[PDB]
Amino acid sequence: LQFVSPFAFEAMQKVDVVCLASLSDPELRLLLPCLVRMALCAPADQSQSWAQDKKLILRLLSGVEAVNSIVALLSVDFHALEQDASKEQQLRHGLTLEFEHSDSPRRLRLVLSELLAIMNKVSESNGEFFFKSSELFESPVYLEEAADVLCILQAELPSLLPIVDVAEALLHVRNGAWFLCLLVANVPDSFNEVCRGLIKNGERQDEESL
Amino acid sequence: AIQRDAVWWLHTVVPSISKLAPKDYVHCLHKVLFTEQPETYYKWDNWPPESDRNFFLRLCSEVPILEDTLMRILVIGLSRELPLGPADAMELADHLVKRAAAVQADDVEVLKVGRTQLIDAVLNLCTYHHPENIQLPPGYQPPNLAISTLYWKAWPLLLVVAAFNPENIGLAAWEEYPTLKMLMEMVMTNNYSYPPCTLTDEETRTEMLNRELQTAQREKQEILAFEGHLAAASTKQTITESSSLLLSQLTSLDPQGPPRRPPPHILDQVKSLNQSLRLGHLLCRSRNPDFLKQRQLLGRLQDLLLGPKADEQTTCEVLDYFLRRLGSSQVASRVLAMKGLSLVLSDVLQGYQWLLRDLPRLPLFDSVRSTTALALQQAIHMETDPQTISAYLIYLSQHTPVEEQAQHSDLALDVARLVVERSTIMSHLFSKLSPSAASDAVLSALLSIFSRYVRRMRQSSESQDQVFLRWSSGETATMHILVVHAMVILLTLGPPRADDSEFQALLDIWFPEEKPLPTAFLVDTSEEALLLPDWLKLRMIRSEVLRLVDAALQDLEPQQLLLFVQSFGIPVSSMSKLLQFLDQAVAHDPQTLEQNIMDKNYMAHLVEVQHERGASGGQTFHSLLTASLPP
Amino acid sequence: RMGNHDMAKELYQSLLTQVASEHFYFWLNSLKEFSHAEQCLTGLQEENYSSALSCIAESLKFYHKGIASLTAASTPLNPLSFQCEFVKLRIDLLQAFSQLICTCNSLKTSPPPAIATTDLQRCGRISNQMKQSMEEFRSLASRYGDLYQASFDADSATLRNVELQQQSCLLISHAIEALILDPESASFQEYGSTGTAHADSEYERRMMSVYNHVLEEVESLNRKYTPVSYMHTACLCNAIIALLKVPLSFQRYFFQKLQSTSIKLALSPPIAVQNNQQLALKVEGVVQHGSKPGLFRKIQSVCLNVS
């Protein structure tokens, strides 16, 4: 399984766009959700230099066919999703086949529900390490789609999905290191806080246990 | 050297002061075991020192068998009034076994039992003892009830003792409970699952147990019906089958029946430690009693199936049982079935060469050909591994039942569902960064099966969505919509390198050069079917073959053009063609601005980006867009 | 001392293999690495923030090497506590600077639309990140103050240097607050009472000039833009550049310890006390000295806090 290159992460952290243009497509596909968000959503800088950089990012993205899935994900009404997630959390206290056959809002709901379930499991435990078999973070074929939806959910629901709690949650799934790495790659300013949270919550090693 | 225990040392003063109740004595005996980890006592204030607990734990994990237990057993046997239960010893042994797995070693005694009171404990646990508070009527036998804790604790420890040391203790289980042999078979299968891979004998295990269970349940209900009137006369409490307390606290002693499947939650936690322990090695030695060690059953099924003595009935039933698992929603079930099928049966697709080379050589392959084809067709919609789906497609391409129209239509519909619905699988199989030989074989298989299907249909409406096709050359055909969408998707993927005849034939029949398209009409309503929807049209636009692009861009209404330009992944040539058509539409219809174009700035930047890529056209659209607002 | 860190790096590199003791070797190696780290961020362009991030990363690499070496150089009766704390607070406020450079660029990752439909929350992640950066810089200023008031034996110039570092921390914190988090409560204007302050070193002059320029830039940009602005991030990042482009000065207390005053603090005593009878604790202490007692300052009174 392929991780995000240090060269690509350095390019993304500095937002140096000609560097992102000179990148291989498998490496670029890992950074796809964020780059789509910076290319399509309304710019916050509103500066001419950033407008030109946004244009180059759009040019670099135009050749990728996988962008259309992320555009479909970004079209979902996130108000209803946030309301549903909050109500489900208040209520609290094949799955991969359903994810595949699901349209964008339904599959967003599926993976968000699984994430919140893992977060509740983490919060309930005092530190004991569990392993939640999810079948969606485990399937090699669907890792790209699940990762894209995860990045879009973290970006569009930041209050409901704090980055440190996602990081603490992802350790309990099979391929969580890869998911966490590309998640941090898509929000590069979260690296220090993710590392700090991971180290702080690392209180019980149990003599280098699982 | 000691002859007494910690319970006796505590009871020396406890019972002397005042004779405690049996429950209090049992609780004291259970607490006196001291099977907990002493290292956990210094996790709060770091007191007592931990420098010695670590050294003591390693030597404490491996312990010998003392004569104190034997002395206590002898005392209990000689005195009828001695209140000493083996439940505390069983709980201590279970706790020690559970703790020892983390620090287990070859030179460490994982378990050691010094008392032969297992038979006495079993006899005393199944018997009924009159309670102090509850007094039953004289001469009337009360129901057989046991404490939940004792029943739950006696099962795991006894099972572990019987399985780990089946030499002497295993003899008792080898003549009473066949479930011990079934669990040994499961252990030899290296999979703690119900049903196990080694428990494939349905005629002996599943059938007899199912036949006996209905009779046993009926007999139990009949026996309990007489006692229900007397029980209700005293309590006057309602009884319901779904809310029956006795069902979850008592169970009929029926060892001959099928084993109980554990819940998925316990199994998920167990699987994490199952690979860590690696308990499959211990089961290879056990062969007495034999349930039907997995290698022996493997060879037995091999000569029953591969050899000339193979029979239709048993082989067909085994294959049906074995292949209905592939359609399940559990990845573990289908993976185990796949591995077992490869092992029973047995340089490209080496892990799947069994299905391509071993299966056709069977004497009764033709008898079972239809059912395995149906099972694979059902498994296509469930399977997620691209290699497994590749093997299934290749098999369902060489060994294709053609004679029945119904079967061929259903097979085409299933493969079409694979091609259309399973978009991620299709993209993964023919990802453009790596055209593999397996990809070439699968693509050739798909075009071959679809070409034969369309040809056979041509040579000649069960479903509502059937469409009555018409060609410009004079041929008639009735087909589903999904199969047409599927061949269109195959043609977008480009020609194979191994073969081009089938690809070119399909492209010619479906989209002949400079000829009218095969207009499609519904069978029932006889109205013009939308054989090329927007998503499919956009899919063929991104294809690198010019014929699909040309067929897709015909008479495009401007809203569709505006939708297509906004899409991503369009090559430069297709983008230039799209912009040329957009310019023609703008020159012929300036009124596309009002009720189609939601925003001007983003589309202007889009057109600028298309020009920056090196795509011609769009100048009139760019001018019209910049006239509304500056870029 | 004067910030010529390339020359210092060369000379310290030359001085290795001349010492005999391993802790002095680690001390000189740490000095070489600190000089290299400060030399790394001399090549900062005025507006290139990507180059700034790379340079700060290189400086942090060399600083981490240096602090590992310095920790290896610490021994009993030579703990190098001031040096360790000073360079630890230099490692911080540089990775805090790196985080603020990252948050400059975080504005290019767009806000959610759900939050965008209704004032500071509309910014998105960047608002909470600026809040975290403000708290981090305030904590850094507090820690620099703690180092200041734990440096009773330091000469005046070292204390002024620590004051300058603390004031840089406070400057970044105030800029973040007044540009992003609370522009309405920006308080009065930056009316410098000192005006043309009589600086005792060129480092002082450069630090105060940077402070005055940053405060002038902040004041002219107070309510002219919404906190989603690229100009606020531009002003903050330019403040980072200005603060880092003036080379750090290692002062006398980093090398020479002169006063060395302590307290013995013998107190009258695992001691059992009854519940009703409350303890009567007497603490006696003597202030110790090395050679000239009151070289820089004299103890007037001793405050004994019991908890």
CSV table of C-alpha atoms in Angstrom, one decimal, chain B residues 104-426:
chain,number,residue,atom,x,y,z
B,104,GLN,CA,3.8,-18.6,27.5
B,105,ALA,CA,7.0,-20.5,26.7
B,106,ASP,CA,7.9,-24.1,25.8
B,107,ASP,CA,9.7,-24.6,29.1
B,108,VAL,CA,6.8,-23.2,31.2
B,109,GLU,CA,3.9,-25.4,32.5
B,110,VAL,CA,0.9,-23.8,30.9
B,111,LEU,CA,-1.5,-26.1,32.9
B,112,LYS,CA,-1.2,-28.8,35.4
B,113,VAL,CA,-4.0,-30.6,37.2
B,114,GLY,CA,-3.1,-32.7,40.3
B,115,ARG,CA,-6.6,-34.0,41.3
B,116,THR,CA,-8.7,-36.7,39.6
B,117,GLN,CA,-11.9,-35.2,41.0
B,118,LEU,CA,-13.2,-34.4,37.5
B,119,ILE,CA,-15.6,-37.3,37.5
B,120,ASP,CA,-16.7,-36.5,41.1
B,121,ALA,CA,-17.2,-32.8,40.2
B,122,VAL,CA,-19.3,-33.8,37.1
B,123,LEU,CA,-21.4,-36.2,39.1
B,124,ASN,CA,-22.0,-33.6,41.9
B,125,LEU,CA,-22.8,-30.8,39.4
B,126,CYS,CA,-25.5,-32.7,37.5
B,127,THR,CA,-27.2,-33.8,40.7
B,128,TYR,CA,-29.9,-31.8,42.4
B,129,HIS,CA,-29.3,-30.5,45.9
B,130,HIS,CA,-32.2,-29.4,48.1
B,131,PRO,CA,-32.0,-25.7,49.0
B,132,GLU,CA,-32.4,-24.3,52.5
B,133,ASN,CA,-35.0,-21.7,51.5
B,134,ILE,CA,-36.9,-23.8,48.9
B,135,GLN,CA,-38.4,-27.1,49.9
B,136,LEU,CA,-39.9,-29.3,47.2
B,137,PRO,CA,-42.9,-31.6,47.7
B,138,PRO,CA,-42.0,-35.0,49.1
B,139,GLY,CA,-41.8,-37.8,46.5
B,140,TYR,CA,-41.9,-35.3,43.6
B,141,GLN,CA,-38.9,-34.8,41.3
B,142,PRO,CA,-38.1,-31.1,40.8
B,143,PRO,CA,-36.8,-29.7,37.5
B,144,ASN,CA,-33.1,-30.0,36.8
B,145,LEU,CA,-31.8,-26.5,37.3
B,146,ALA,CA,-28.2,-25.3,37.7
B,147,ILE,CA,-26.5,-22.0,38.4
B,148,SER,CA,-25.5,-20.0,35.3
B,149,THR,CA,-22.0,-19.1,36.7
B,150,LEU,CA,-21.1,-22.8,37.5
B,151,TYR,CA,-22.4,-24.0,34.1
B,152,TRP,CA,-20.5,-21.3,32.2
B,153,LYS,CA,-17.3,-21.9,34.2
B,154,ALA,CA,-17.4,-25.7,33.8
B,155,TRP,CA,-17.7,-25.6,30.0
B,156,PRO,CA,-14.5,-23.7,29.0
B,157,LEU,CA,-12.1,-25.2,31.5
B,158,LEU,CA,-13.2,-28.8,30.8
B,159,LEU,CA,-13.1,-28.2,27.0
B,160,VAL,CA,-9.6,-26.8,27.3
B,161,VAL,CA,-8.5,-29.7,29.5
B,162,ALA,CA,-10.0,-32.2,27.0
B,163,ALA,CA,-8.5,-30.6,23.9
B,164,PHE,CA,-5.0,-29.7,25.2
B,165,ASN,CA,-4.5,-33.1,26.9
B,166,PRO,CA,-6.6,-35.7,25.0
B,167,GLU,CA,-4.6,-38.7,26.1
B,168,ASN,CA,-6.2,-39.7,29.4
B,169,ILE,CA,-8.9,-37.0,29.9
B,170,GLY,CA,-9.8,-37.2,26.2
B,171,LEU,CA,-10.9,-40.8,26.5
B,172,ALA,CA,-14.1,-39.8,28.4
B,173,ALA,CA,-15.0,-37.2,25.7
B,174,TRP,CA,-14.2,-39.8,23.0
B,175,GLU,CA,-17.1,-42.1,24.1
B,176,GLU,CA,-19.8,-39.7,25.3
B,177,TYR,CA,-19.8,-36.5,23.3
B,178,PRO,CA,-19.2,-36.4,19.5
B,179,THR,CA,-19.1,-32.6,19.9
B,180,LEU,CA,-15.5,-33.1,21.2
B,181,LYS,CA,-14.6,-34.8,17.9
B,182,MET,CA,-16.4,-32.0,16.0
B,183,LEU,CA,-14.4,-29.4,17.9
B,184,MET,CA,-11.1,-31.3,17.3
B,185,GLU,CA,-12.0,-31.2,13.6
B,186,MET,CA,-12.6,-27.5,13.8
B,187,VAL,CA,-9.3,-26.9,15.6
B,188,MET,CA,-7.6,-29.0,12.9
B,189,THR,CA,-9.3,-26.7,10.3
B,190,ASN,CA,-7.4,-23.8,12.0
B,191,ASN,CA,-10.7,-21.9,12.0
B,192,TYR,CA,-12.9,-21.5,15.1
B,193,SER,CA,-16.1,-21.2,13.0
B,194,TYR,CA,-19.6,-22.8,13.2
B,195,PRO,CA,-19.8,-24.8,10.8
B,196,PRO,CA,-16.1,-25.7,10.5
B,197,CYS,CA,-14.3,-26.5,7.2
B,198,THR,CA,-13.7,-30.1,8.5
B,199,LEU,CA,-17.4,-30.5,9.5
B,200,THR,CA,-18.5,-30.7,5.9
B,201,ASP,CA,-20.4,-34.0,6.5
B,202,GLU,CA,-23.9,-32.7,6.3
B,203,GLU,CA,-25.6,-36.1,5.9
B,204,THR,CA,-24.0,-37.3,9.2
B,205,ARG,CA,-23.8,-34.1,11.3
B,206,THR,CA,-26.3,-31.5,10.0
B,207,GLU,CA,-29.1,-33.9,8.9
B,208,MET,CA,-29.2,-36.1,12.0
B,209,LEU,CA,-28.9,-33.1,14.4
B,210,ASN,CA,-31.7,-31.2,12.5
B,211,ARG,CA,-34.0,-34.3,12.6
B,212,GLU,CA,-33.3,-34.9,16.3
B,213,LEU,CA,-33.7,-31.3,17.4
B,214,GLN,CA,-37.3,-31.0,16.5
B,215,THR,CA,-38.2,-34.2,18.3
B,216,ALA,CA,-36.1,-33.1,21.4
B,217,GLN,CA,-37.8,-29.7,21.5
B,218,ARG,CA,-41.2,-31.2,21.2
B,219,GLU,CA,-40.5,-33.7,24.0
B,220,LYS,CA,-39.2,-31.0,26.2
B,221,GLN,CA,-42.3,-28.8,25.5
B,222,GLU,CA,-44.5,-31.8,26.3
B,223,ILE,CA,-42.7,-32.5,29.5
B,224,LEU,CA,-42.8,-28.9,30.6
B,225,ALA,CA,-46.5,-28.5,29.7
B,226,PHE,CA,-47.5,-30.7,32.7
B,227,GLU,CA,-45.3,-28.8,35.1
B,228,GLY,CA,-46.4,-25.4,33.8
B,229,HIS,CA,-49.9,-25.8,35.4
B,230,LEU,CA,-48.3,-26.4,38.8
B,231,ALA,CA,-45.7,-23.7,38.4
B,232,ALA,CA,-48.4,-21.1,37.4
B,233,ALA,CA,-50.6,-22.1,40.3
B,234,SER,CA,-48.0,-20.8,42.7
B,235,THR,CA,-46.4,-17.8,40.9
B,236,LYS,CA,-49.3,-16.7,38.6
B,237,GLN,CA,-46.7,-15.1,36.3
B,238,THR,CA,-47.0,-14.9,32.5
B,239,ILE,CA,-44.8,-17.1,30.4
B,240,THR,CA,-43.7,-16.3,26.8
B,241,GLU,CA,-41.4,-18.2,24.4
B,242,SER,CA,-39.4,-15.1,23.5
B,243,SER,CA,-39.1,-14.0,27.1
B,244,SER,CA,-38.5,-17.4,28.6
B,245,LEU,CA,-35.9,-17.0,31.4
B,246,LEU,CA,-35.2,-20.8,31.6
B,247,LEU,CA,-34.1,-20.8,27.9
B,248,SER,CA,-31.1,-18.6,28.6
B,249,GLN,CA,-30.3,-20.2,32.0
B,250,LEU,CA,-30.8,-23.9,31.4
B,251,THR,CA,-30.3,-26.2,28.4
B,252,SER,CA,-31.1,-29.8,27.6
B,253,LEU,CA,-28.1,-32.2,27.8
B,254,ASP,CA,-28.0,-33.2,24.2
B,255,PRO,CA,-24.3,-33.6,23.2
B,256,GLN,CA,-25.2,-35.4,20.0
B,257,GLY,CA,-26.8,-32.2,18.6
B,258,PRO,CA,-25.1,-29.6,16.5
B,259,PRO,CA,-22.8,-27.1,18.2
B,260,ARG,CA,-23.8,-23.6,19.2
B,261,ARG,CA,-22.6,-20.8,16.9
B,262,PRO,CA,-21.1,-18.0,18.9
B,263,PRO,CA,-22.3,-14.4,18.3
B,264,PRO,CA,-20.3,-12.2,15.9
B,265,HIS,CA,-19.2,-9.8,18.7
B,266,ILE,CA,-17.4,-12.5,20.7
B,267,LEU,CA,-15.9,-14.0,17.5
B,268,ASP,CA,-14.5,-10.6,16.4
B,269,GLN,CA,-12.6,-10.2,19.7
B,270,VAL,CA,-11.5,-13.9,19.7
B,271,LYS,CA,-10.1,-13.7,16.2
B,272,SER,CA,-7.5,-11.0,17.3
B,273,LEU,CA,-5.9,-13.5,19.7
B,274,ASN,CA,-6.6,-16.7,17.6
B,275,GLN,CA,-3.8,-16.0,15.2
B,276,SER,CA,-1.5,-14.9,18.1
B,277,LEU,CA,-2.0,-18.2,20.0
B,278,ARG,CA,-1.6,-20.4,16.9
B,279,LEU,CA,-3.6,-23.3,18.3
B,280,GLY,CA,-3.8,-25.3,15.0
B,281,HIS,CA,-0.6,-27.2,15.7
B,282,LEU,CA,-2.1,-29.1,18.7
B,283,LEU,CA,-5.0,-30.6,16.7
B,284,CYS,CA,-2.9,-32.4,14.1
B,285,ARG,CA,-2.0,-35.1,16.6
B,286,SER,CA,-5.6,-35.9,17.7
B,287,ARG,CA,-7.1,-38.7,15.7
B,288,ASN,CA,-9.1,-40.8,18.3
B,289,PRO,CA,-12.1,-40.4,18.4
B,290,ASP,CA,-12.4,-39.5,14.7
B,291,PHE,CA,-15.3,-37.3,13.7
B,292,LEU,CA,-15.1,-38.4,10.0
B,293,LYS,CA,-6.4,-34.1,11.2
B,294,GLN,CA,-7.8,-32.1,8.3
B,295,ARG,CA,-5.4,-33.8,5.9
B,296,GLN,CA,-7.2,-37.2,6.3
B,297,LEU,CA,-10.6,-35.7,5.5
B,298,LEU,CA,-9.0,-33.8,2.6
B,299,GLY,CA,-7.6,-37.0,1.1
B,300,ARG,CA,-10.9,-38.8,1.8
B,301,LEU,CA,-13.0,-36.1,0.0
B,302,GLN,CA,-10.4,-36.1,-2.8
B,303,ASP,CA,-10.7,-39.8,-3.6
B,304,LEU,CA,-14.4,-39.6,-3.1
B,305,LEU,CA,-14.6,-36.7,-5.6
B,306,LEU,CA,-11.6,-36.8,-7.9
B,307,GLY,CA,-11.5,-40.6,-8.4
B,308,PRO,CA,-13.6,-42.7,-10.7
B,309,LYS,CA,-15.9,-43.7,-7.8
B,310,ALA,CA,-17.5,-40.3,-7.7
B,311,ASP,CA,-21.3,-40.2,-7.4
B,312,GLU,CA,-23.7,-37.6,-8.6
B,313,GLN,CA,-25.8,-37.1,-5.4
B,314,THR,CA,-23.1,-36.6,-2.7
B,315,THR,CA,-20.8,-34.5,-4.9
B,316,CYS,CA,-23.7,-32.3,-6.1
B,317,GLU,CA,-24.9,-31.7,-2.5
B,318,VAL,CA,-21.3,-31.0,-1.3
B,319,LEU,CA,-20.7,-28.5,-4.2
B,320,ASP,CA,-24.1,-26.8,-3.5
B,321,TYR,CA,-23.2,-26.5,0.2
B,322,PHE,CA,-19.7,-25.3,-0.6
B,323,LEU,CA,-20.7,-22.7,-3.3
B,324,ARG,CA,-23.7,-21.2,-1.5
B,325,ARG,CA,-21.2,-19.6,0.8
B,326,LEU,CA,-19.7,-17.5,-1.9
B,327,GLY,CA,-22.9,-15.5,-2.2
B,328,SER,CA,-22.9,-14.7,1.5
B,329,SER,CA,-22.2,-11.2,2.8
B,330,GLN,CA,-19.2,-12.4,4.9
B,331,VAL,CA,-15.8,-12.1,3.4
B,332,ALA,CA,-14.4,-14.7,5.8
B,333,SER,CA,-16.9,-17.3,4.7
B,334,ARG,CA,-16.1,-16.9,1.0
B,335,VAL,CA,-12.3,-16.7,1.6
B,336,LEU,CA,-12.4,-20.0,3.6
B,337,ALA,CA,-14.6,-21.6,0.9
B,338,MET,CA,-12.2,-20.5,-1.8
B,339,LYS,CA,-9.1,-21.8,0.1
B,340,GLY,CA,-10.9,-25.1,0.9
B,341,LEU,CA,-12.0,-25.5,-2.7
B,342,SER,CA,-8.5,-24.9,-4.0
B,343,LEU,CA,-7.0,-27.3,-1.5
B,344,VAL,CA,-9.6,-30.1,-2.4
B,345,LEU,CA,-9.3,-29.6,-6.1
B,346,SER,CA,-5.5,-29.2,-6.1
B,347,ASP,CA,1.2,-20.4,-14.9
B,348,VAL,CA,-1.1,-17.3,-15.0
B,349,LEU,CA,-3.6,-16.8,-12.1
B,350,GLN,CA,-1.7,-19.4,-10.1
B,351,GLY,CA,-3.9,-19.1,-7.1
B,352,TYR,CA,-6.9,-19.5,-9.4
B,353,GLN,CA,-5.5,-22.1,-11.9
B,354,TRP,CA,-7.5,-24.8,-10.1
B,355,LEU,CA,-10.8,-23.3,-11.5
B,356,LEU,CA,-9.4,-23.1,-15.0
B,357,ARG,CA,-7.4,-26.4,-15.3
B,358,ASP,CA,-8.5,-28.9,-12.5
B,359,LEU,CA,-12.3,-28.5,-12.6
B,360,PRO,CA,-13.0,-29.2,-16.3
B,361,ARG,CA,-11.1,-32.6,-16.0
B,362,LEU,CA,-13.6,-34.0,-13.5
B,363,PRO,CA,-15.7,-37.1,-14.6
B,364,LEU,CA,-19.0,-35.4,-13.5
B,365,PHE,CA,-18.1,-31.8,-14.4
B,366,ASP,CA,-21.0,-31.6,-16.9
B,367,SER,CA,-23.5,-32.7,-14.2
B,368,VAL,CA,-22.5,-29.9,-11.9
B,369,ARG,CA,-21.7,-27.2,-14.5
B,370,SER,CA,-25.0,-25.4,-14.3
B,371,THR,CA,-25.1,-25.0,-10.4
B,372,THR,CA,-21.5,-23.7,-10.1
B,373,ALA,CA,-22.2,-21.3,-12.9
B,374,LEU,CA,-25.3,-20.0,-11.1
B,375,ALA,CA,-23.3,-19.8,-7.8
B,376,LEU,CA,-20.5,-17.8,-9.5
B,377,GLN,CA,-23.1,-15.5,-11.1
B,378,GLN,CA,-24.5,-14.9,-7.6
B,379,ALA,CA,-21.0,-14.5,-6.2
B,380,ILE,CA,-20.1,-11.8,-8.8
B,381,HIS,CA,-22.5,-9.3,-7.1
B,382,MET,CA,-20.9,-10.2,-3.7
B,383,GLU,CA,-17.2,-10.7,-4.4
B,384,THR,CA,-14.9,-7.8,-4.0
B,385,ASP,CA,-11.4,-9.2,-4.8
B,386,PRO,CA,-10.6,-8.2,-8.5
B,387,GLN,CA,-8.6,-11.4,-9.0
B,388,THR,CA,-11.4,-13.6,-7.8
B,389,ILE,CA,-13.8,-11.8,-10.1
B,390,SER,CA,-11.3,-12.1,-12.9
B,391,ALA,CA,-11.2,-15.9,-12.4
B,392,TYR,CA,-15.0,-16.1,-12.3
B,393,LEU,CA,-15.4,-14.1,-15.5
B,394,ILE,CA,-12.9,-16.3,-17.3
B,395,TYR,CA,-14.6,-19.4,-16.2
B,396,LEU,CA,-18.0,-17.9,-17.1
B,397,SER,CA,-16.6,-17.2,-20.5
B,398,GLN,CA,-15.0,-20.6,-21.5
B,399,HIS,CA,-17.6,-22.8,-19.7
B,400,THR,CA,-20.7,-20.9,-20.7
B,401,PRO,CA,-24.1,-22.7,-20.9
B,402,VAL,CA,-25.5,-21.3,-24.2
B,403,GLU,CA,-28.3,-23.7,-25.1
B,404,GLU,CA,-31.0,-22.1,-22.8
B,405,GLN,CA,-32.2,-18.6,-23.8
B,406,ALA,CA,-33.3,-18.0,-20.2
B,407,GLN,CA,-29.9,-19.0,-18.7
B,408,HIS,CA,-28.0,-16.9,-21.3
B,409,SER,CA,-30.2,-13.9,-20.7
B,410,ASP,CA,-29.7,-14.2,-16.9
B,411,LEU,CA,-25.9,-14.6,-17.3
B,412,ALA,CA,-25.7,-11.5,-19.6
B,413,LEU,CA,-27.8,-9.6,-17.0
B,414,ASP,CA,-25.5,-10.6,-14.2
B,415,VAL,CA,-22.3,-9.7,-16.1
B,416,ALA,CA,-24.0,-6.4,-17.1
B,417,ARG,CA,-24.8,-5.7,-13.5
B,418,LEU,CA,-21.1,-6.3,-12.7
B,419,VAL,CA,-20.0,-3.9,-15.5
B,420,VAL,CA,-22.5,-1.1,-14.7
B,421,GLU,CA,-23.1,-1.1,-11.0
B,422,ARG,CA,-19.7,-2.3,-9.8
B,423,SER,CA,-18.0,0.9,-11.1
B,424,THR,CA,-15.1,0.8,-8.6
B,425,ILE,CA,-14.3,-2.9,-9.4
B,426,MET,CA,-14.4,-2.1,-13.2
